[PDB]
Design an enzyme around this catalytic site. Structure first.
Site, PDB file in Angstrom:
ATOM      1  N   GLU A 164     -16.203  21.580  -8.256  1.00 18.25           N
ATOM      2  CA  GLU A 164     -15.856  21.121  -9.598  1.00 18.25           C
ATOM      3  C   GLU A 164     -14.602  21.818 -10.124  1.00 18.25           C
ATOM      4  OE1 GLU A 164     -19.087  20.351 -12.241  1.00 18.25           O
ATOM      5  OE2 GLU A 164     -20.455  19.906 -10.594  1.00 18.25           O
ATOM      6  N   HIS A 222     -17.757  18.413 -14.113  1.00 15.05           N
ATOM      7  CA  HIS A 222     -16.328  18.178 -14.071  1.00 15.05           C
ATOM      8  C   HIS A 222     -15.971  17.266 -12.936  1.00 15.05           C
ATOM      9  CE1 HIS A 222     -17.551  22.215 -15.127  1.00 15.05           C
ATOM     10  NE2 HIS A 222     -16.650  22.132 -16.088  1.00 15.05           N
ATOM     11  N   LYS A 257     -21.658  19.504 -21.538  1.00 16.06           N
ATOM     12  CA  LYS A 257     -20.200  19.544 -21.410  1.00 16.06           C
ATOM     13  C   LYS A 257     -19.739  18.686 -20.257  1.00 16.06           C
ATOM     14  CE  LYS A 257     -16.416  22.308 -19.602  1.00 16.06           C
ATOM     15  NZ  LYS A 257     -16.146  23.444 -18.677  1.00 16.06           N
TER      16      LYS A 257
HETATM   17  C1  LIG Z   1     -10.900  23.321 -19.443  1.00 14.96           C
HETATM   18  C2  LIG Z   1     -10.437  24.758 -19.139  1.00 14.96           C
HETATM   19  C3  LIG Z   1     -11.392  25.437 -18.374  1.00 14.96           C
HETATM   20  O1  LIG Z   1     -12.318  24.822 -17.838  1.00 14.96           O
HETATM   21  C4  LIG Z   1     -11.152  26.805 -18.145  1.00 14.96           C
HETATM   22  O2  LIG Z   1     -12.215  27.472 -17.447  1.00 14.96           O
HETATM   23  C5  LIG Z   1      -9.864  26.943 -17.335  1.00 14.96           C
HETATM   24  O3  LIG Z   1      -9.543  28.310 -17.141  1.00 14.96           O
HETATM   25  C6  LIG Z   1      -8.729  26.246 -18.078  1.00 14.96           C
HETATM   26  C7  LIG Z   1      -9.126  24.788 -18.335  1.00 14.96           C
HETATM   27  O4  LIG Z   1      -9.334  24.118 -17.083  1.00 14.96           O
HETATM   28  C8  LIG Z   1      -7.995  24.095 -19.099  1.00 14.96           C
HETATM   29  O5  LIG Z   1      -7.623  24.638 -20.164  1.00 14.96           O
HETATM   30  O6  LIG Z   1      -7.531  23.045 -18.602  1.00 14.96           O
END
Ligand SMILES: C[C@H]1C(=O)[C@@H](O)[C@H](O)C[C@]1(O)C(=O)O
Ligand SMILES: C[C@H]1C(=O)[C@@H](O)[C@H](O)C[C@]1(O)C(=O)O
Lengths: 248, 247
Positions: free
Chosen positions: A86, A143, A170
């Site tokens: 993910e 994700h 989420k």
């Molecule tokens: C959505 C954000 C995260 O999931 C964080 O853990 C990552 O370090 C940064 C992130 O992917 C983001 O800001 O796009």
């Protein structure tokens, strides 16, 4: 709409809450980031445990947790191992993932844990119960860093997260088009007005998806991700937009 | 395409900021034009329907001159919004066309607003008169009660293109949060599949605010800010547009 109050932050009310993600490969590097992040203004600290190299040692993991907790004693702390699957940084067996998450839970050092929906239903159920037995809240997550599922699929996943006892479902998905961003916003809204009785976090990734990091109060995402140091918005910029929207 | 007024290129980059000047008489209009010099924005809309001495073409044109005198280099849009579409009053169709032809003739304004639902023959006649005098048309349709289907809104914006509008414009009132998505959906469809020119769209009120902010994302080439609900102070609006534009 149940809310999650952590420390004194109320998630699922008011302006979406700003999460920053701390990445450290070792103890010193976690500590360096902890000191630098501590100057900044934000609502929730996510520790991205998958960047930490010494993950085979539970004691090392808990030492890193304690450094972060001690650096910001009043900040809501979320413990997140994101699997490579993910979009995380390294591979882990389901048994070790559960060892870390259980150790984080029963340590007393963290306020919330991230638990991936597709870990396995027996493992997820068990880990939700353990967290709740130890007064830790669960952000259950899914994700897709490649593409955006249909609106109906995304809602199905968030609803399954509610059914599994998630405190905060989420979902984060990658747009391949501007249409995809509308689909994620449409999913967020359906969840908000027909199903959600707890806070939900949604996001469309990348430059194309930035609007989803700003539009949470409107369509029903309770938190957003911001950068202290495409799609990444600096926390002071982010907070500006969120206030402007809120007070319009 | 884009549309250029006094070096402002509409349809490229960040959405342009329109501010509306609203004075009920010549005193207030002159006073507002002067105060508006202190704000930063791209386009000045004069909301002619607020003006009480509306029967007198000469009075209306004098008010236009005062505005142009205070701001000689601003893109200036002459707008009479009928009460039917959210405006302050109603005039005869004949006087509406008279006022717009007078603005066009005067050389004092860069663009006029024509309401799509004024009538097809009158619309084309006025669009042609504007272009003959090198004046652009913002063709407008406003529903202050509800939001039409995305299919219907796209049909209206395409019909504005067909009647020669330099910039098709729709503003609609959301009743549900879904209505706001519907407006954004119509915007994206227009921009990506139909528009050969800039288009302006808005979802009104507080519920619709994101539509004021997200124009770059979904295809609205301009937005409205306030110098003084759902209204956004120009400087705040500019701040948000820049954060989106520079990500
Ligand atoms: C959505 C954000 C995260 O999931 C964080 O853990 C990552 O370090 C940064 C992130 O992917 C983001 O800001 O796009
Ligand atoms: C859509 C906007 C306009 O058309 C302006 O003439 C009016 O002053 C404000 C407006 O209705 C808005 O910003 O919602």
């Amino acid at each position: 709409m149940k809310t999650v109050t952590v420390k004194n932050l109320i998630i699922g009310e008011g302006m979406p809450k700003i999460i920053v993600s701390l990445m450290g490969r070792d103890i010193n590097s976690v500590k360096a980031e902890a000191l630098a992040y501590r100057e900044a203004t934000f609502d929730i600290l996510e520790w991205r445990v998958d960047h930490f190299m010494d993950i085979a040692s539970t004691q090392s993991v808990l030492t890193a947790a304690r450094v972060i907790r001690d650096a910001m004693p009043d900040i809501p702390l979320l413990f997140t191992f994101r699997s490579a699957k993910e979009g995380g940084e390294q591979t882990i067996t389901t048994q070790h993932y559960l060892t870390l998450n259980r150790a984080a839970i029963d340590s007393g050092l963290v306020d919330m844990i991230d638990l991936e929906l597709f870990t396995g239903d027996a493992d997820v159920k068990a880990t939700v119960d353990y967290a709740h037995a130890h007064n830790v809240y669960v952000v259950m997550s899914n994700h897709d860093f490649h593409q955006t599922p249909s609106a109906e699929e995304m809602v199905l996943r968030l609803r399954k997260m509610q059914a599994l006892g998630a405190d905060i479902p989420k979902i984060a998905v990658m747009p391949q088009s501007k249409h995809d961003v509308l689909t994620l916003l449409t999913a967020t809204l359906e969840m908000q007005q027909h199903y959600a009785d707890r806070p939900v976090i949604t996001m469309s990734m990348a430059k194309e998806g930035v609007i989803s990091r700003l539009a949470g109060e409107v369509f029903g995402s309770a938190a957003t991700f911001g950068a202290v140091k495409p799609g990444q918005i600096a926390v002071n910029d982010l907070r500006s937009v969120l206030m402007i929207l809120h007070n319009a």
